[PDB]
Amino acid sequence: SHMKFGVNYTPSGEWFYTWLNPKWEVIRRDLAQIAELGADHVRIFPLWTLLQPNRTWINPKALADVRRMVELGGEAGLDVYVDVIQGHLSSFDFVPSWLVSWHEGSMFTDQSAIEAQSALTEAIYGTLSDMKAFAGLTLGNECNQFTDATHPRRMPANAEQIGEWLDTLIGLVAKRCRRDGRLIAHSENDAIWYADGHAFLPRYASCKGDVTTVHSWVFNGTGQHYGPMSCESLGHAAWLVELSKAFAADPHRPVWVQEIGAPGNVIDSADAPEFCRRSIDAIADCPDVFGVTWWCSHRIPSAFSDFPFFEHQLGLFDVDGTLTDVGKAFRDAIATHRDTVAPPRTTAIVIPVDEQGDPLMRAAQAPGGSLFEAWANLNRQGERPCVITSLDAGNPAKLANRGIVRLERVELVAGHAYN
Amino acid sequence: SHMKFGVNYTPSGEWFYTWLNPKWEVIRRDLAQIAELGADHVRIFPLWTLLQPNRTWINPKALADVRRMVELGGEAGLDVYVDVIQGHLSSFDFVPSWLVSWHEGSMFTDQSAIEAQSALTEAIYGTLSDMKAFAGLTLGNECNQFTDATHPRRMPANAEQIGEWLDTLIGLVAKRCRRDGRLIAHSENDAIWYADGHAFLPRYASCKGDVTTVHSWVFNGTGQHYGPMSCESLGHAAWLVELSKAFAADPHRPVWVQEIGAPGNVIDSADAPEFCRRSIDAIADCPDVFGVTWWCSHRIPSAFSDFPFFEHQLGLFDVDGTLTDVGKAFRDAIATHRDTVAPPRTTAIVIPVDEQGDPLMRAAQAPGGSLFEAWANLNRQGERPCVITSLDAGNPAKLANRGIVRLERVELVAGHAYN
Numbered sequence: 001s002h003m004k005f006g007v008n009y010t011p012s013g014e015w016f017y018t019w020l021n022p023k024w025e026v027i028r029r030d031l032a033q034i035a036e037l038g039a040d041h042v043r044i045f046p047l048w049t050l051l052q053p054n055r056t057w058i059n060p061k062a063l064a065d066v067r068r069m070v071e072l073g074g075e076a077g078l079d080v081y082v083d084v085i086q087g088h089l090s091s092f093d094f095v096p097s098w099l100v101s102w103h104e105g106s107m108f109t110d111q112s113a114i115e116a117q118s119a120l121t122e123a124i125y126g127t128l129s130d131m132k133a134f135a136g137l138t139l140g141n142e143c144n145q146f147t148d149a150t151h152p153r154r155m156p157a158n159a160e161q162i163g164e165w166l167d168t169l170i171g172l173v174a175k176r177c178r179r180d181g182r183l184i185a186h187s188e189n190d191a192i193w194y195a196d197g198h199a200f201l202p203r204y205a206s207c208k209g210d211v212t213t214v215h216s217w218v219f220n221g222t223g224q225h226y227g228p229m230s231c232e233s234l235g236h237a238a239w240l241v242e243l244s245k246a247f248a249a250d251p252h253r254p255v256w257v258q259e260i261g262a263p264g265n266v267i268d269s270a271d272a273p274e275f276c277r278r279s280i281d282a283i284a285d286c287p288d289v290f291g292v293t294w295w296c297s298h299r300i301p302s303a304f305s306d307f308p309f310f311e312h313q314l315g316l317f318d319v320d321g322t323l324t325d326v327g328k329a330f331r332d333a334i335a336t337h338r339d340t341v342a343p344p345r346t347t348a349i350v351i352p353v354d355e356q357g358d359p360l361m362r363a364a365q366a367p368g369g370s371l372f373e374a375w376a377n378l379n380r381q382g383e384r385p386c387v388i389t390s391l392d393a394g395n396p397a398k399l400a401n402r403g404i405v406r407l408e409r410v411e412l413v414a415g416h417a418y419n
Numbered sequence: 420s421h422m423k424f425g426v427n428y429t430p431s432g433e434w435f436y437t438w439l440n441p442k443w444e445v446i447r448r449d450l451a452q453i454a455e456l457g458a459d460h461v462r463i464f465p466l467w468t469l470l471q472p473n474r475t476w477i478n479p480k481a482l483a484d485v486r487r488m489v490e491l492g493g494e495a496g497l498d499v500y501v502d503v504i505q506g507h508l509s510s511f512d513f514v515p516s517w518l519v520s521w522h523e524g525s526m527f528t529d530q531s532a533i534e535a536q537s538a539l540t541e542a543i544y545g546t547l548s549d550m551k552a553f554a555g556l557t558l559g560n561e562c563n564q565f566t567d568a569t570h571p572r573r574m575p576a577n578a579e580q581i582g583e584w585l586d587t588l589i590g591l592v593a594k595r596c597r598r599d600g601r602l603i604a605h606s607e608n609d610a611i612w613y614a615d616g617h618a619f620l621p622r623y624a625s626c627k628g629d630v631t632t633v634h635s636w637v638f639n640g641t642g643q644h645y646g647p648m649s650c651e652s653l654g655h656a657a658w659l660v661e662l663s664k665a666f667a668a669d670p671h672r673p674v675w676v677q678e679i680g681a682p683g684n685v686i687d688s689a690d691a692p693e694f695c696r697r698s699i700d701a702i703a704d705c706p707d708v709f710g711v712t713w714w715c716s717h718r719i720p721s722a723f724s725d726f727p728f729f730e731h732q733l734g735l736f737d738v739d740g741t742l743t744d745v746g747k748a749f750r751d752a753i754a755t756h757r758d759t760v761a762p763p764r765t766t767a768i769v770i771p772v773d774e775q776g777d778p779l780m781r782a783a784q785a786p787g788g789s790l791f792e793a794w795a796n797l798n799r800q801g802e803r804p805c806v807i808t809s810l811d812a813g814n815p816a817k818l819a820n821r822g823i824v825r826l827e828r829v830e831l832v833a834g835h836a837y838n
Contacts, residue, residue, distance in 0.1 A: 017472045020439075021480035049468060053436045056724040061440035092516040098725045100519075101512045101572045153520045153572070305475040306517045 001341065003284065004291030005334045006041035006078075007034045008259060010315060012298035016089060019047050022065055024072070031076040033317055034297050037327065038334040041079040041135060043258065043293055044069055045086050047094050048120075048140075055098045055116045063127045074133025082128065083187070084121050085140030090300075090311050093146075093153075108147055108157035108165045118172055125173050129180065136183030138258070139169050142215065144188040144200040159199045166208045177210070185209040187258060190220055193243060194366035194418050203357050206247035211290045214240035215259040216279075219310075221367040223266030225417035231380040232367070233267075234275065238282035239375055241289060243365060246351050246387040251401040254290035257283055261295035262326055264310040273329035280333040285384065287342045294330050345386035347406040349374050353389045361412045368415025378408065421760070422703065423710025424753040425460035425497075426453045427678060429734060431717035435508060438466050441484055443491070450495040452736055453716050456746065457753040460498040460554060462677065462712055463488055464505050466513045467539075467559075474517045474535045482546045493552025502606070503543050504536060504559030509719075509730050512565075512572075519572075527566055527576035527584045537591055544592045548599065555602035557677070558588050561634065563607040563619040581618045585627045596629070604628035606677060609639055612662060613785035613837050622776050625667035630709045633659035634678035635698075638729075640786040642685030644836035648694065650799040651786070652685075657701035658794055660708060662784060665770050665806040670820040673709035676702055680714035681745055683729035692748035699752040704803065706761045713749050764805035765824040768794050771831060772808040780831045787834025793827060 011018040012030050034042055050062045066082065073080035085107075086094055099105055099113060107113050121137070128134040146155045147162065157165070170184055177184045186209050192200040193214075206212050216237035218228065226232035241255045260279060262272035276294075283292055299315030300307060316327035323331070351371060352360045365371040378385040385408065392398045393407060430437040431449050453461055469481045485501065492499035504526075505513055518524055518532060526532050540556070547553040565574040566581065576584070589603050596603045605628050611619040612633075625631050635656035637647065645651035660674045679698060681691035695713075702708055718734035719726060735746035742750075770790060771779045784790040797804035804827070811817040812826055 017476065017478065020469060020472065020478050050439060053439065054723045054725070057436065057722060059436065059439050091521050093520045094516055095519070097511040097513055100514070101570065102510055103725055104571055151520065152523055303476060304473045306473070306522055 002339060003289050003337060004040055006039050006043060006081075006291060006293040007037070007316065008293055008296040009034065009042040009044045010296040010298050010300065012317065012319070012321065013301065015300050015304060016045060016047055016086075017304075019050050019062070019065060022068070024068065027069060028072050028075075029321075030298060031073050031078060033321070035076040035078055037316070037331045039078065041081060041291065041293070042073055042297070043081045043083065043138075044073070045083050045089060045141060046124075048085050048087055049094045049096050051124075052096055052116060052120050054096075055112060058120060058123050063123060066124065067127050067131070070128055070131055070134050074131065078133065079135035080133050081136050081138065081183070082124060082134070083138045083141050084124050085117060085143060087140040088142050088145050091306075091308055104153070106147075106155035106157060107143070108155055109161050114165065114168060117169060121169055121172050125176065129176070134182065136177065136185065136210075137173065138213065139166075139186040142187055142189040144192060144198070147199050148191055148195070149197070157199050159201055162199045163201075163204060163208075166204055170209055183210045185211050185213050185256065187213045187215065189215055190217070190240070193240065194220070194362055196362045198362075201358050202244070202247040202362075206244050206253065207249050211254040211256045212244045212248065213256045213258040214244055216240050216257060217259070217261065217263060219263045219266045221415075221417035221419055223263075225368055228267040229271055229275065232372075232376045234278045235282045235376060235379050237279050238286050238379070239372070241283060241286045242345070242375065242385065242387045245288075246389050246392070247357065251398070252288050254288050255286070256290040257292045259293060259295040261314045264313045265308065269313065273325045276326050276329040277333055280330075280337065282379075284337040284340050285342045287344060289342070344403045345384045346403055347378065347383050347408060348386045348388040348393075348402075348404050349378065349408045349410065350393050351387060351389050352412060353391055357389060357391055361414060363414035363418070364412040366415045366418040368417030370410045370413035372415060374408065374410040421758060422708050422756060423459055425458045425462065425500075425710060425712040426456070426735065427712055427715040428453065428461040428463050429715040429717050429719065431736065431738070431740065432720065434719050434723060435464060435466060435505075436723075438469055438481070438484060441487070443487065446488060447491050447495070448740075449717060450492050450497060452740070454495040454497055456735070456750045458497065460500060460710070460712070461492055461716070462500045462502060462557075463492070464502050464508060464560060465543075467504050467506055468513045468515050470543075471515055471535060471539050473515075474531065477539060477542050482542060485543065486546050486550070489547055489550055489553050493550065497552065498554035499552050500555050500557065501543060501547065501553070502557045502560050503540050504562060506559040507561050507564050510725075510727055523572075525566075525574035525576060526562070527574055528580050533584065533587060536588060540588055540591050544595065548595070553601065555596065555604065555629075556592065557632065558585070558605040560606055561608040562605070563610060563617070566618055567610055567614065568616075576618050578618045578620055581620075582623060582627075585623055589628055602629040604630050604632050604675070606632045606634065608634055609636070609659070612659065613639070613781055615781045617781070620777050621663070621666040625663050625665075625672065630673045630675045631663045631667065632675045632677040633663055635659050635676060636678070636680065636682060638682045638685045640834075640836035640838055642682075644787055647686040648690055651792075651795045653694065653697045654701045654795060654798050656698050657705050657798070658791070660702060660705045661764070661794070661804065661806045664707075665808050665811070666776060670817070671707050673707050674705075675709040676711045678712060678714040680733045683732045684727065688732070691745045695745050695748040696752055699749075699756065701798075703756045703759045704761045706763060708761070763822050764803050765822055766797065766802050767805045767807045767812075767823045767826055768797065769812050769826055769828045770806060770808045772810055774810075776808060776810055780833060782833035782837070783831040785834045785837040787836035789829045789832035791834060793829045797827065
């Protein structure tokens, strides 16, 4: 049992631009710094444009560099999780030329592009499969952002095509992962939980892949609307954990807080260490948390432009390599919650869903919405709420398997704070 | 003095994907093969995504790799011309993440992007400036394709903004180039000659930069409409040379046929050698030709996908490294025209222009148009025609400088063969 603690690895000095010519001695020291925090894993991010520059040619040097980074993670004493398709990082898209402009197409529906992503997933798994430190794969960081209606070069897809895309790519490696002792997962930004009409559905995160991933960012309106150090803000990661369980078929499926950070566009730097400590305290009171992975390890140097300004400050280590106050808070939180075990949560707020298990109104569970607030209010009062669907609530076996004793209900009211 | 002969260098084995991890021993063999043809220069193509992955960071390893390729070109005895911004190659766009989707913007009008392109031009010149083999720079291969309405992710610009973009980037290095003995130029696809409404204007090619560049591709409708081995097709490159002079302020400005190939989508493979020989015969009969640079050196291996099929066959050397029949024709053509001197051309076709020197109807000088056909007819009849504008035609001083004796005028009729 017990929560894993790790960091999302942003290479010091050159960020992901380092993949062009990695400085292995610097990367080695980067990973040793992360291990010194007490972290047990890292999550790493190769670039799709370098991995697969042609639809039918994967660059062996790019694969070998991924293997070397994994090897250095293991030498630091870390398990290493690899995100296959980036794809999207920190406001930037990295899309190979064969899926751009004259060759524009949707990664979700174009069959020849799906076969290329399948080959890349297998090539990454196969490259790394003999490494004791290779712990698992995620399809890619927040790939759903490409199909969101807000994306300025949207890759179209309906919900059925998204389900098929997930099934195709996860299905390539799920059995190997199972036989080998590794994990396969996928990752969406919080539009999956919050955005009505979004083609990625909550049950996809909570049922497909081995563990649910959530990425908790209180710049999504939670910090602005309620306050950066409000209960709604501090408990937002714990809220995603419990919300996501409502949509899981398996009553003890682990939930991975795969990203959480203290974004400086809503949280004052003076409050960021307390935000970290208290957010992790709230996560640690939720059962079945797979782990907590902070965003991110090393600050982006100021010589790089066009990042939203707060992205530069998210690193636990400053640009000179020293441990920031948030880094100290995360190190302290790892030690605090080493052997803590959260007790069962038995009072559930109920989410009305349709016959397929999808919310009647995702806006009601978004920031500002009635279900979001009912959970935050119950949490502020010490009730330690969990979340179930109306379908689960009419199933005495599922209530029994989760130990649910009290049901709390609220009408559906859309929030308007979300983004 | 005499025409230069060179090759557009496409790296064997990995194409421009070799820039990720260049195999220097193969690149040396490639360049030695080009020299063995009798070529005296190559044109090379670094990738913008690798050179400048952040708006304010140019990758020093990518600069060092360009320098090494120039160094190997000289060691083979070749002068090396470098295209700064690719940008566009063989149906693919290579645009850095900081100019796409969430960061979408126009390289032609966004000031911060223009300053980045300025920094990249200075960085390439300065990296290469101490090298005996570095012979000059072109801003980039056919950059105008980004601003044409045909482009699916168009970068907007009006004609004045395009002129300012050319002036800004050429102005950075024009003086150094003259002091150092190198050249600076820019390159457009044939929309500049042929497409009404296009924001690149003919006089920009013929007046800005040290030499006019033309890229001659008879799949632009010429080969389809008149026949691949017609006089219209075989004379197309000479036509672009002479057409371009009409718009030059300097009556002896050199014209560089910076690309010509024998595209297999309109020219039968068995005819490509005679197409090469006779196209170059026609170029060699035009005065003031700077040089002829064949597209391209080495065929694209068939393991790479999504190229138009004919692109694979354009190389002078096959994928196994052996010299193709077209390669033999080009080698033979270099020896044939080593010492050729074209006599002056004195019979001129007249292009109607407005007071700024821009054509009244570019469609009339495109394939199928009256001015296009009037030139081809005179050329087929052995009249060796040149081209002037209507402004020049009413100025006996300009007629004197070019030695024009006979004028032929024709009514404007638009072609419809052009793409």
